Coordinates of C-alpha atoms and ligand atoms in Angstrom, one line a residue:
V10 CA -89.2 28.3 167.5
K11 CA -86.9 31.2 166.6
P12 CA -83.5 31.0 164.9
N13 CA -80.4 32.7 166.2
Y14 CA -78.6 33.9 163.1
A15 CA -75.4 35.8 164.0
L16 CA -72.9 37.6 161.7
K17 CA -70.0 35.4 160.7
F18 CA -68.3 37.1 157.7
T19 CA -68.5 40.3 155.8
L20 CA -67.5 40.1 152.1
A21 CA -66.0 43.2 150.5
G22 CA -64.9 43.8 147.0
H23 CA -67.7 45.1 144.9
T24 CA -67.4 48.7 144.0
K25 CA -71.1 49.5 143.3
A26 CA -74.4 48.1 144.7
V27 CA -74.6 44.4 145.0
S28 CA -77.6 43.1 143.0
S29 CA -78.0 39.4 143.8
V30 CA -76.4 36.6 145.8
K31 CA -77.0 32.9 145.3
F32 CA -75.5 29.7 146.9
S33 CA -74.4 26.9 144.6
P34 CA -76.6 23.8 144.9
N35 CA -73.6 21.8 146.1
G36 CA -73.2 24.3 148.9
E37 CA -69.6 25.2 148.5
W38 CA -69.9 28.6 146.8
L39 CA -71.7 31.9 147.0
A40 CA -72.0 33.9 143.8
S41 CA -72.6 37.7 143.8
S42 CA -73.5 40.0 141.0
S43 CA -73.2 43.8 141.0
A44 CA -73.9 47.1 139.2
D45 CA -70.1 47.2 138.9
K46 CA -70.4 44.7 135.9
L47 CA -68.7 41.9 137.9
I48 CA -69.6 38.4 139.2
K49 CA -67.7 37.3 142.3
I50 CA -67.3 33.8 143.8
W51 CA -66.9 33.3 147.5
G52 CA -66.4 30.3 149.7
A53 CA -69.8 29.6 151.3
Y54 CA -68.5 28.5 154.7
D55 CA -65.6 30.9 155.3
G56 CA -66.4 33.8 153.0
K57 CA -63.1 33.3 151.2
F58 CA -62.9 35.3 148.0
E59 CA -62.3 32.9 145.1
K60 CA -62.4 34.8 141.8
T61 CA -64.0 37.6 139.8
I62 CA -65.8 36.7 136.5
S63 CA -65.9 39.6 134.1
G64 CA -67.2 40.4 130.6
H65 CA -70.5 42.2 130.7
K66 CA -70.3 45.8 129.4
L67 CA -72.8 47.3 131.9
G68 CA -74.2 46.3 135.3
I69 CA -75.6 43.0 136.3
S70 CA -79.0 42.7 138.1
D71 CA -79.2 38.9 138.6
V72 CA -77.1 35.7 138.5
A73 CA -78.1 32.1 138.9
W74 CA -76.5 28.6 139.2
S75 CA -77.0 25.5 137.1
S76 CA -78.2 22.3 139.0
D77 CA -74.7 20.8 138.9
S78 CA -73.1 23.9 140.3
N79 CA -70.8 24.2 137.2
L80 CA -72.5 27.1 135.3
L81 CA -73.8 30.5 136.0
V82 CA -76.1 32.7 134.0
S83 CA -76.1 36.5 134.5
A84 CA -78.6 39.2 133.4
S85 CA -77.2 42.5 132.4
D86 CA -78.1 46.1 131.5
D87 CA -76.1 45.5 128.3
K88 CA -79.3 43.7 127.1
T89 CA -77.6 40.2 127.2
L90 CA -77.3 37.2 129.4
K91 CA -74.1 35.3 129.6
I92 CA -73.5 31.7 130.5
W93 CA -70.3 31.1 132.4
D94 CA -68.2 28.1 133.2
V95 CA -67.4 28.8 136.8
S96 CA -64.2 26.7 136.9
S97 CA -62.6 28.5 133.9
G98 CA -64.4 31.9 134.4
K99 CA -65.0 31.9 130.6
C100 CA -68.1 33.1 128.9
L101 CA -69.5 30.1 127.0
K102 CA -72.5 31.9 125.3
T103 CA -73.9 35.4 125.1
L104 CA -77.7 35.3 124.8
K105 CA -78.8 38.2 122.6
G106 CA -82.4 39.1 121.9
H107 CA -83.9 41.3 124.6
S108 CA -84.3 45.0 123.5
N109 CA -83.7 46.5 127.0
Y110 CA -82.0 45.6 130.3
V111 CA -82.2 42.0 131.3
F112 CA -83.3 42.0 135.0
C113 CA -83.8 38.4 136.1
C114 CA -82.8 34.9 135.2
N115 CA -82.9 31.2 136.2
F116 CA -82.1 27.7 135.0
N117 CA -84.6 25.0 134.9
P118 CA -83.9 21.9 137.1
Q119 CA -82.8 20.0 134.0
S120 CA -80.4 23.0 133.4
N121 CA -81.0 22.7 129.6
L122 CA -83.1 26.0 129.6
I123 CA -82.6 29.5 130.9
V124 CA -85.6 31.8 131.5
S125 CA -85.1 35.6 131.5
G126 CA -87.1 38.6 132.2
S127 CA -86.4 42.1 130.8
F128 CA -87.4 45.8 130.9
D129 CA -88.6 45.1 127.4
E130 CA -91.7 43.4 129.1
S131 CA -90.9 40.0 127.7
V132 CA -89.9 36.6 129.1
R133 CA -87.5 34.7 126.9
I134 CA -86.7 30.9 127.1
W135 CA -83.2 29.9 125.9
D136 CA -81.4 26.7 125.0
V137 CA -78.3 26.4 127.2
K138 CA -76.2 24.3 124.9
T139 CA -76.7 26.4 121.7
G140 CA -77.5 29.8 123.3
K141 CA -80.5 30.1 120.9
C142 CA -83.7 31.8 122.0
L143 CA -86.4 29.2 121.8
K144 CA -89.4 31.3 122.7
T145 CA -90.3 35.0 123.3
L146 CA -93.4 35.4 125.5
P147 CA -95.2 38.8 125.5
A148 CA -95.7 38.2 129.1
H149 CA -96.3 41.6 130.6
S150 CA -96.9 45.3 129.9
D151 CA -94.2 46.7 132.1
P152 CA -90.7 45.5 133.2
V153 CA -90.5 41.9 134.4
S154 CA -89.3 41.6 138.0
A155 CA -88.7 37.9 138.4
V156 CA -88.9 34.5 136.6
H157 CA -88.6 31.1 138.2
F158 CA -89.1 27.4 137.2
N159 CA -91.0 24.9 139.3
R160 CA -89.6 21.7 140.6
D161 CA -90.3 19.6 137.5
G162 CA -89.5 22.4 135.0
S163 CA -92.9 22.3 133.4
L164 CA -94.0 25.8 134.8
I165 CA -92.5 29.3 134.8
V166 CA -93.8 31.9 137.2
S167 CA -93.3 35.6 136.2
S168 CA -94.0 38.9 137.9
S169 CA -94.0 42.5 136.7
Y170 CA -94.5 46.2 137.5
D171 CA -97.7 45.9 135.6
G172 CA -99.2 44.3 138.7
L173 CA -99.5 40.8 137.3
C174 CA -98.2 37.4 138.3
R175 CA -98.5 34.8 135.6
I176 CA -97.8 31.1 135.3
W177 CA -96.6 29.8 131.9
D178 CA -96.4 26.4 130.3
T179 CA -92.7 25.9 129.6
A180 CA -93.2 23.5 126.7
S181 CA -95.7 25.7 124.7
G182 CA -95.1 29.1 126.2
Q183 CA -98.8 29.7 126.7
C184 CA -100.3 31.1 129.8
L185 CA -101.8 28.7 132.3
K186 CA -103.1 31.2 134.9
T187 CA -102.9 34.8 135.9
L188 CA -102.4 34.4 139.7
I189 CA -102.5 38.1 140.5
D190 CA -104.6 40.2 138.2
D191 CA -104.3 43.7 139.6
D192 CA -102.8 46.8 137.9
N193 CA -101.3 48.1 141.2
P194 CA -99.1 47.5 143.2
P195 CA -96.1 46.2 141.2
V196 CA -95.3 42.6 141.9
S197 CA -91.6 42.9 142.6
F198 CA -90.6 39.3 143.2
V199 CA -92.0 35.7 142.8
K200 CA -90.6 32.2 143.3
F201 CA -92.0 28.7 143.6
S202 CA -91.7 26.9 146.9
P203 CA -89.3 24.0 146.8
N204 CA -92.1 21.4 146.2
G205 CA -93.6 23.6 143.5
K206 CA -97.1 23.8 145.2
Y207 CA -96.9 27.4 146.5
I208 CA -95.7 30.7 145.1
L209 CA -94.1 33.4 147.3
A210 CA -94.8 36.9 145.9
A211 CA -93.6 40.3 147.0
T212 CA -95.6 43.5 146.3
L213 CA -94.4 47.0 146.7
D214 CA -96.6 47.8 149.6
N215 CA -94.5 46.1 152.3
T216 CA -96.2 42.8 151.8
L217 CA -95.1 39.2 151.1
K218 CA -97.7 36.5 150.3
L219 CA -97.7 32.8 150.1
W220 CA -100.1 31.6 147.4
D221 CA -101.5 28.1 146.6
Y222 CA -100.8 27.7 142.9
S223 CA -103.5 25.1 142.2
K224 CA -106.3 26.9 144.1
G225 CA -105.0 30.4 143.2
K226 CA -105.6 31.5 146.7
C227 CA -103.5 33.4 149.2
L228 CA -102.6 31.2 152.2
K229 CA -100.3 33.5 154.3
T230 CA -99.3 37.2 154.4
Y231 CA -96.0 38.4 155.9
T232 CA -95.6 42.0 157.0
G233 CA -93.5 44.3 159.1
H234 CA -90.6 45.0 156.8
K235 CA -90.2 48.0 154.4
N236 CA -90.6 47.3 150.6
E237 CA -92.0 50.0 148.4
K238 CA -89.2 50.7 145.9
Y239 CA -86.9 47.8 145.1
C240 CA -87.2 44.2 143.7
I241 CA -85.9 42.4 146.8
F242 CA -85.4 38.7 146.7
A243 CA -87.2 36.5 149.2
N244 CA -86.6 32.9 150.2
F245 CA -87.9 29.7 151.8
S246 CA -85.5 28.6 154.5
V247 CA -85.8 24.8 154.9
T248 CA -82.6 23.5 156.4
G249 CA -83.8 24.1 160.0
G250 CA -86.9 25.9 161.1
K251 CA -89.3 26.6 158.2
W252 CA -88.9 30.4 157.6
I253 CA -89.5 33.0 155.1
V254 CA -86.5 35.3 154.6
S255 CA -86.3 38.7 152.9
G256 CA -84.3 41.9 152.7
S257 CA -85.9 45.2 153.5
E258 CA -85.5 48.9 152.8
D259 CA -84.8 49.6 156.4
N260 CA -81.4 47.8 156.0
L261 CA -82.4 44.7 157.9
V262 CA -82.9 41.0 157.0
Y263 CA -86.4 39.9 158.1
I264 CA -87.1 36.3 159.1
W265 CA -90.7 35.1 159.6
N266 CA -92.3 31.8 160.8
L267 CA -93.8 30.5 157.6
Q268 CA -96.8 29.0 159.4
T269 CA -97.6 31.6 162.1
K270 CA -96.4 34.6 160.0
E271 CA -94.8 36.1 163.1
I272 CA -91.4 37.8 162.7
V273 CA -88.8 35.7 164.5
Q274 CA -85.6 37.6 163.9
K275 CA -84.3 40.8 162.3
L276 CA -80.6 40.8 161.4
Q277 CA -78.9 44.2 161.8
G278 CA -75.6 45.3 160.3
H279 CA -76.0 46.5 156.8
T280 CA -75.9 50.2 156.1
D281 CA -78.1 50.3 153.0
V282 CA -81.1 48.5 151.6
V283 CA -80.8 44.7 151.7
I284 CA -81.6 43.9 148.1
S285 CA -80.9 40.2 148.1
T286 CA -80.9 37.3 150.5
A287 CA -80.1 33.6 149.9
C288 CA -80.4 30.5 152.0
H289 CA -77.7 27.8 152.0
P290 CA -78.9 24.4 150.7
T291 CA -77.8 22.3 153.6
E292 CA -76.6 24.6 156.5
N293 CA -78.5 27.2 158.5
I294 CA -76.6 29.9 156.7
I295 CA -78.1 33.2 155.2
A296 CA -76.2 35.4 152.7
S297 CA -77.3 39.1 152.5
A298 CA -76.2 41.9 150.3
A299 CA -76.8 45.7 150.2
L300 CA -76.9 48.7 147.9
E301 CA -74.3 51.3 147.2
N302 CA -73.7 53.0 150.6
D303 CA -72.7 49.5 151.9
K304 CA -71.7 47.3 148.9
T305 CA -70.9 44.3 151.1
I306 CA -72.2 40.8 151.5
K307 CA -72.8 39.3 154.9
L308 CA -72.8 35.6 156.0
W309 CA -75.0 34.7 159.0
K310 CA -75.2 31.4 160.8
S311 CA -77.8 29.9 163.1
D312 CA -77.9 26.9 165.3
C313 CA -81.4 26.0 164.2
Ligands
HLS401 C1 -89.7 52.3 138.3 O1 -89.7 51.1 137.5 C2 -88.9 50.1 137.9 C3 -88.1 50.2 139.0 C4 -87.3 49.1 139.4 C5 -86.4 49.3 140.6 N1 -85.1 48.6 140.5 C6 -84.8 47.6 141.3 O2 -85.6 47.2 142.1 C7 -83.5 46.9 141.1 C8 -82.5 47.4 140.3 C9 -81.3 46.7 140.2 C10 -81.2 45.5 140.8 F1 -80.0 44.8 140.6 C11 -82.1 44.9 141.5 C12 -82.0 43.6 142.2 N2 -82.0 42.5 141.2 C13 -83.1 41.7 141.0 N3 -84.2 41.7 141.8 C14 -85.1 40.7 141.4 C15 -84.4 40.1 140.2 N4 -83.1 40.8 140.1 C16 -83.3 45.6 141.7 C17 -87.4 47.9 138.7 C18 -88.2 47.8 137.6 O3 -88.4 46.6 136.9 C19 -87.6 45.5 137.3 C20 -89.0 48.9 137.2

């Protein structure tokens, strides 16, 4: 019915706002990225600081794991992405081509491609092994807020401050569908559901929506949080109860029942906007991270 997430660890070390937290697919790590130009690796279960990964010349707005938990990709204001070997901490490739800040990134499930979105209004598709840019999509007419592959890798969903949500054919780069075709409000985050049938989208009017991709129709709307300014990550929680999880500009983590749309819990503790949340792949564990008045990551655990 409702979860009982409670604060277990607070992870300190970043010196500017945290921008993104992500659990490794094998469950043992949390990665965090920050405006302080650093990636940090933490033990997922005990919050134990593991290492700092450094090399970007300006702040990092997103980081993402490969399917095998061995690689990270980061998106930076230095206009590049970097692919990192987590074990060594070494930068394997620097992905050059965007002409403005890189804001968002993800691997495909095969982990042979990286997709990126930028303030230059484009979506780029990159070959992981060579670091070459395979395609540049003129996807949007304002900064790109999120990019995500579906479960079989054949689709990319993108969102932008231009108000659009578009779905792209990975193989050809051509647009399959414009899911949201408004010019306002900004679409500040999007992500496929784990089975690839639905799309979770945030708009900067304090709204999250669950869309049916195939039918192009809105199935659920989630409200009650504060989101009018920042591109805040949102998540499907699937290890226990089926929830939607999101940060909020009132410094709380919100948890909703996916089916009934009722708020089931609000997690209090951060002292700034909760910009990023992540859900552990096998345990009922949430990671949350906050902006510059706070700069910490918090690990929360639930019995269900
Ligand atoms: C007025 O125009 C704007 C204002 C903005 C406002 N900036 C942010 O919300 C922001 C800044 C730094 C971050 F690290 C993060 C968190 N990172 C992240 N979220 C989803 C993928 N990665 C968010 C954005 C924008 O385009 C994107 C255009």
